[PDB]
Amino acid sequence: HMIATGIALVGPGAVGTTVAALLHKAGYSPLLCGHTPRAGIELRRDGADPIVVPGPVHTSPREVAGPVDVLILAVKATQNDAARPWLTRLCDERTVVAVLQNGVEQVEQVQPHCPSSAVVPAIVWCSAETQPQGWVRLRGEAALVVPTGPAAEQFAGLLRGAGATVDCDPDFTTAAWRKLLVNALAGFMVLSGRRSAMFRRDDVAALSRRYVAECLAVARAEGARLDDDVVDEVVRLVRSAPQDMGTSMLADRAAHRPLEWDLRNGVIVRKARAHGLATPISDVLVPLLAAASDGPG
Amino acid sequence: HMIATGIALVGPGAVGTTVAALLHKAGYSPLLCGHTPRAGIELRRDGADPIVVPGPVHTSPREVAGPVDVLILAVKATQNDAARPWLTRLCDERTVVAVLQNGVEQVEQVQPHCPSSAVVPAIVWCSAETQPQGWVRLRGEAALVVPTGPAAEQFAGLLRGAGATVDCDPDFTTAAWRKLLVNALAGFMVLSGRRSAMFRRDDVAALSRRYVAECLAVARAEGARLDDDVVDEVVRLVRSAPQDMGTSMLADRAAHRPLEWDLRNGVIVRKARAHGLATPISDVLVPLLAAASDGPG
Ligand SMILES: NC(=O)c1ccc[n+]([C@@H]2O[C@H](COP(=O)([O-])OP(=O)(O)OC[C@H]3O[C@@H](n4cnc5c(N)ncnc54)[C@H](OP(=O)(O)O)[C@@H]3O)[C@@H](O)[C@H]2O)c1
Ligand SMILES: NC(=O)c1ccc[n+]([C@@H]2O[C@H](COP(=O)([O-])OP(=O)(O)OC[C@H]3O[C@@H](n4cnc5c(N)ncnc54)[C@H](OP(=O)(O)O)[C@@H]3O)[C@@H](O)[C@H]2O)c1
Ligand SMILES: [Cl-]
Ligand SMILES: [Cl-]
């Protein structure tokens, strides 16, 4: 195991396929660990040739053998509990576990499933969406942000070696909250059932700036070092996206799947409470998102 | 025209079919005036035999001849402008025009389309929903509230004579706002994409009471005579509905049709402004509803 790097991908979805495709094109053979059987997985980046990554997608932990050197976790955070048996099977104390999930709670959520492994949280900036036809559409290059330190630097080496854009940030808390401001705001799309062009409306954009400011106060109390300019920057960013760009949580709502509402929006309320911060806009959005996700009704 | 009463139904949808069916069963032959051609329309009240009302549904004003004695308008308020040529064709100064729409702006919206006719606003309490199979499902009896005065009493006579439950209320402003508190709250269902059982959640119910109180302040400034008890009563009412009961605005959202968002929710903001009343919860809900309805995205 000194030369060949054993890599497992747990969660071969939009983000997982994006990463598996880069690894495959670089010549690695990641072990695909999923929920829905398939012979392989396919990534189509706009403007590029398709990349097909051979499987099979394994759907029982009994079918695979560990330990592996690197485990890339790309399930939704709603699926972390169900993914646990993959981590038990595949991780030991030398495994590096990369958690490619939104929010700011990656290590806290996943570390207990691999208690002796180094966990590398990874902020992913990309637009990836599974199509009805079975392949994943990637619009633009993906970029990842990880911390500094040995495990994170090893993981960044692996991805950079395969052609990925990765930043090792000595202030990961700030990087994670920066992405969370964007993802939290994108929750509006789930309630309206509209793509990014909804933010081009004056009324929505005004509301959006107030919400991002409310989220920003919480981010700062939690240690994020962000300028006041970020409020309007977030709103300009979503307005500048292609008019039909959605978000993964809207795709889940349209497929009637559980949402990462607590990871992306509930977290604002939960973290606000120790600091005694008010979140009046979140107090409206969060119950509607949680109901949308979990019912009843 | 002293004995036979000429009746036209403009808008043969969920509510329109509900009313047409009662009239038909009483022996009237209402002229059906619609948008989508059909040979007739069908009402199925739960627990009762189906009632089929013969058409055809006329879809051009050129195909019909007025004036009529009673015109029953049951289009959505989003369709009032498109329905105008029916009113021009069918109404004269002796026509009674009944407006079976939600909100509190019936006379203001419709009177200019029939400037010399008496307009009777009608608050409808019912649960009617067009099914994929083409017939309308009615769950429970329908009840209507109209004002007092000659035109309203003539209209109530006609419906009561046909077996309908109708109240002639000397304080119609209060009756209209009472229904609007319910309908405004039901907007939550459109954002969450869930039926009435969503209100059984603690978080939603807490938010709901705050929203109904915000709406109540506006209703009172506009002349509604409602007790403080109404806030919790509205929330108990939606919780007590069958778990799968929706609202017409959710059905429109699911069919990708324009919503009555301004009639049911935008009105709270618009009326609050002359009284200098704050509407912070509406300031969140309304832009999301308007975007859901009208895009872009
Ligand atoms: N999509 C984006 O553009 C994007 C961008 C940045 C960050 N993110 C974040 O990245 C994370 C992953 O998002 P995604 O969009 O890739 O989600 P996704 O497309 O829904 O992918 C999740 C994958 O995990 C599989 N899965 C479910 N349960 C599993 C289990 N017990 N074991 C193994 N695999 C399982 C799913 O299969 P089934 O669907 O068959 O259950 C699916 O293939 C989320 O935290 C998201 O917020 C997404
Ligand atoms: N459904 C309920 O349980 C309920 C209860 C109380 C109050 N209300 C209120 O009652 C009103 C009517 O609601 P609804 O649920 O009956 O709506 P609906 O089922 O959508 O009915 C509207 C009808 O008008 C037709 N139409 C559209 N444009 C037209 C035009 N230019 N001329 C003539 N007809 C036209 C529609 O046809 P297409 O669909 O083919 O366009 C449809 O048959 C609304 O204000 C609503 O808020 C509804
Ligand atoms: Cl490197
Ligand atoms: Cl009577």
Coordinates of N, CA, C and O in Angstrom, one line a residue, chain A residues 188 190-198 200-201 203-204 207 210 243 253 281 283-297, chain B residues 188 190-198 200-201 203-204 207 210 243 253 281 283-297:
Chain A
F188 N -34.4 29.9 -0.5 CA -35.5 30.7 -1.1 C -36.0 29.9 -2.3 O -37.3 29.8 -2.5
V190 N -36.2 26.8 -2.8 CA -36.9 25.6 -2.4 C -38.4 26.0 -2.1 O -39.3 25.2 -2.4
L191 N -38.6 27.1 -1.4 CA -39.9 27.6 -1.0 C -40.7 28.1 -2.2 O -41.9 27.8 -2.4
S192 N -40.0 28.8 -3.2 CA -40.7 29.4 -4.3 C -40.8 28.4 -5.5 O -41.7 28.6 -6.3
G193 N -40.0 27.4 -5.4 CA -39.9 26.4 -6.5 C -39.4 27.1 -7.8 O -39.9 26.7 -8.9
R194 N -38.4 28.0 -7.7 CA -37.9 28.7 -8.8 C -36.4 28.6 -8.8 O -35.8 28.5 -7.7
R195 N -35.8 28.7 -10.0 CA -34.3 28.7 -10.1 C -33.7 30.1 -9.8 O -34.4 31.1 -9.4
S196 N -32.4 30.3 -10.0 CA -31.7 31.5 -9.6 C -32.2 32.9 -10.1 O -32.0 33.9 -9.4
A197 N -32.9 32.9 -11.2 CA -33.3 34.1 -11.7 C -34.4 34.8 -10.8 O -34.6 36.0 -11.0
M198 N -35.0 34.1 -9.9 CA -35.9 34.7 -9.0 C -35.3 35.8 -8.1 O -36.0 36.8 -7.7
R200 N -33.4 38.1 -9.2 CA -33.4 39.3 -10.0 C -34.6 40.2 -9.8 O -34.5 41.4 -10.2
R201 N -35.6 39.7 -9.1 CA -36.7 40.6 -8.7 C -36.3 41.5 -7.6 O -35.5 41.2 -6.7
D203 N -38.1 42.7 -5.1 CA -38.6 42.4 -3.8 C -37.8 41.2 -3.2 O -37.4 41.3 -2.0
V204 N -37.5 40.2 -4.0 CA -36.7 39.1 -3.5 C -35.3 39.5 -3.1 O -34.7 39.1 -2.1
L207 N -35.3 41.4 0.3 CA -35.5 40.4 1.3 C -34.1 39.6 1.5 O -33.7 39.3 2.7
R210 N -31.5 41.4 3.6 CA -31.8 41.3 5.0 C -31.5 39.9 5.6 O -31.0 39.8 6.7
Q243 N -29.9 31.7 -15.4 CA -31.2 31.9 -14.9 C -31.9 30.6 -14.5 O -32.8 30.6 -13.7
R253 N -36.3 18.6 -3.2 CA -37.7 18.9 -3.0 C -38.5 18.4 -4.2 O -39.6 17.8 -4.0
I281 N -36.1 36.4 10.3 CA -36.4 35.9 9.0 C -36.2 34.4 9.0 O -37.1 33.7 8.5
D283 N -36.8 32.5 11.5 CA -37.9 32.0 12.3 C -39.1 31.8 11.4 O -40.0 31.0 11.8
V284 N -39.2 32.4 10.2 CA -40.2 32.2 9.2 C -39.8 31.0 8.3 O -40.6 30.1 8.0
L285 N -38.6 31.1 7.7 CA -38.1 30.2 6.7 C -38.0 28.8 7.2 O -38.3 27.8 6.5
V286 N -37.4 28.6 8.4 CA -37.0 27.3 8.9 C -38.2 26.4 9.1 O -38.2 25.2 8.6
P287 N -39.3 26.8 9.8 CA -40.4 25.9 9.9 C -41.0 25.5 8.6 O -41.5 24.4 8.4
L288 N -41.0 26.4 7.6 CA -41.6 26.1 6.3 C -40.7 25.1 5.5 O -41.2 24.2 4.9
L289 N -39.4 25.3 5.6 CA -38.4 24.3 5.1 C -38.5 23.0 5.7 O -38.5 21.9 5.0
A290 N -38.6 22.9 7.1 CA -38.6 21.6 7.8 C -39.9 20.9 7.4 O -39.9 19.7 7.2
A291 N -41.1 21.6 7.4 CA -42.3 21.0 6.9 C -42.3 20.5 5.5 O -42.7 19.4 5.2
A292 N -41.7 21.3 4.6 CA -41.5 20.9 3.2 C -40.8 19.6 3.1 O -41.1 18.7 2.3
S293 N -39.7 19.4 3.9 CA -38.9 18.3 3.9 C -39.5 17.0 4.5 O -39.5 15.9 4.0
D294 N -40.1 17.2 5.7 CA -40.4 16.1 6.6 C -41.9 15.9 6.9 O -42.3 14.9 7.5
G295 N -42.7 16.8 6.4 CA -44.2 16.7 6.6 C -44.5 17.0 8.1 O -43.7 17.5 8.8
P296 N -45.7 16.6 8.5 CA -46.7 15.9 7.6 C -47.4 16.8 6.6 O -47.0 17.9 6.5
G297 N -48.4 16.3 5.9 CA -49.0 17.0 4.8 C -48.4 16.5 3.5 O -48.9 17.0 2.4
Chain B
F188 N -49.0 29.2 3.5 CA -47.9 28.4 4.0 C -47.8 27.1 3.2 O -46.7 26.6 2.9
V190 N -48.5 26.5 0.1 CA -47.9 26.8 -1.2 C -46.4 26.8 -1.2 O -45.7 26.3 -2.1
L191 N -45.8 27.4 -0.1 CA -44.4 27.5 0.0 C -43.8 26.1 0.4 O -42.7 25.8 -0.1
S192 N -44.4 25.4 1.3 CA -43.9 24.1 1.8 C -44.3 23.0 0.8 O -43.6 21.9 0.9
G193 N -45.3 23.2 0.0 CA -45.8 22.1 -0.8 C -46.4 21.0 0.0 O -46.3 19.8 -0.4
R194 N -47.1 21.3 1.1 CA -47.7 20.3 1.9 C -49.2 20.7 2.1 O -49.5 21.8 2.1
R195 N -50.0 19.7 2.4 CA -51.4 19.8 2.8 C -51.6 20.2 4.3 O -50.6 20.5 5.0
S196 N -52.8 20.3 4.7 CA -53.2 20.9 6.0 C -52.5 20.3 7.2 O -52.3 21.0 8.2
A197 N -52.1 19.0 7.2 CA -51.5 18.4 8.3 C -50.2 19.1 8.7 O -49.7 18.9 9.9
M198 N -49.5 19.9 7.8 CA -48.3 20.6 8.2 C -48.5 21.5 9.4 O -47.6 21.8 10.2
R200 N -50.0 20.9 12.0 CA -50.0 20.1 13.3 C -48.6 20.1 13.9 O -48.5 19.7 15.1
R201 N -47.6 20.5 13.2 CA -46.2 20.7 13.7 C -46.2 21.8 14.7 O -46.9 22.9 14.5
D203 N -43.7 23.9 15.4 CA -43.0 25.1 14.9 C -43.9 25.8 13.9 O -44.0 27.1 14.0
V204 N -44.5 25.1 13.0 CA -45.5 25.8 12.1 C -46.6 26.4 12.8 O -47.0 27.6 12.5
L207 N -45.5 29.8 14.4 CA -45.4 30.8 13.4 C -46.7 31.2 12.9 O -46.9 32.4 12.6
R210 N -48.5 33.8 15.1 CA -47.9 35.1 14.9 C -48.3 35.7 13.6 O -48.6 36.9 13.6
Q243 N -56.1 15.6 6.9 CA -54.6 15.8 6.7 C -54.2 16.1 5.3 O -53.2 16.7 5.1
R253 N -50.3 26.2 -7.9 CA -48.8 26.1 -7.9 C -48.3 24.8 -8.5 O -47.4 24.7 -9.3
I281 N -43.7 39.4 9.0 CA -43.8 38.0 8.5 C -44.3 38.1 7.0 O -43.7 37.4 6.2
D283 N -43.6 40.4 5.0 CA -42.5 40.9 4.2 C -41.6 39.8 3.7 O -40.8 39.9 2.8
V284 N -41.6 38.6 4.4 CA -40.9 37.4 4.0 C -41.7 36.6 3.0 O -41.2 36.2 2.0
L285 N -43.0 36.3 3.4 CA -43.9 35.4 2.6 C -44.2 36.0 1.2 O -44.2 35.2 0.3
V286 N -44.5 37.3 1.2 CA -45.1 37.8 -0.1 C -44.1 37.8 -1.2 O -44.5 37.3 -2.3
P287 N -42.8 38.2 -1.0 CA -41.9 38.1 -2.2 C -41.7 36.6 -2.6 O -41.6 36.4 -3.8
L288 N -41.7 35.7 -1.7 CA -41.5 34.3 -2.1 C -42.8 33.7 -2.8 O -42.6 33.0 -3.8
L289 N -44.0 34.1 -2.4 CA -45.2 33.8 -3.1 C -45.3 34.4 -4.5 O -45.7 33.7 -5.4
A290 N -45.0 35.7 -4.6 CA -45.0 36.4 -5.9 C -44.0 35.7 -6.9 O -44.4 35.5 -8.0
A291 N -42.8 35.5 -6.4 CA -41.8 34.8 -7.2 C -42.3 33.4 -7.6 O -42.1 33.0 -8.8
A292 N -42.9 32.6 -6.7 CA -43.4 31.3 -7.0 C -44.4 31.4 -8.2 O -44.4 30.5 -9.1
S293 N -45.3 32.4 -8.1 CA -46.3 32.6 -9.1 C -45.8 33.0 -10.4 O -46.2 32.5 -11.5
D294 N -45.0 34.1 -10.4 CA -44.8 34.9 -11.6 C -43.3 34.8 -12.1 O -43.1 35.3 -13.2
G295 N -42.4 34.2 -11.4 CA -41.1 34.0 -11.8 C -40.3 35.4 -11.7 O -40.8 36.3 -11.1
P296 N -39.2 35.5 -12.4 CA -38.6 34.5 -13.2 C -37.9 33.4 -12.4 O -38.1 33.3 -11.2
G297 N -37.3 32.5 -13.1 CA -36.8 31.3 -12.5 C -37.7 30.1 -12.8 O -37.4 28.9 -12.4

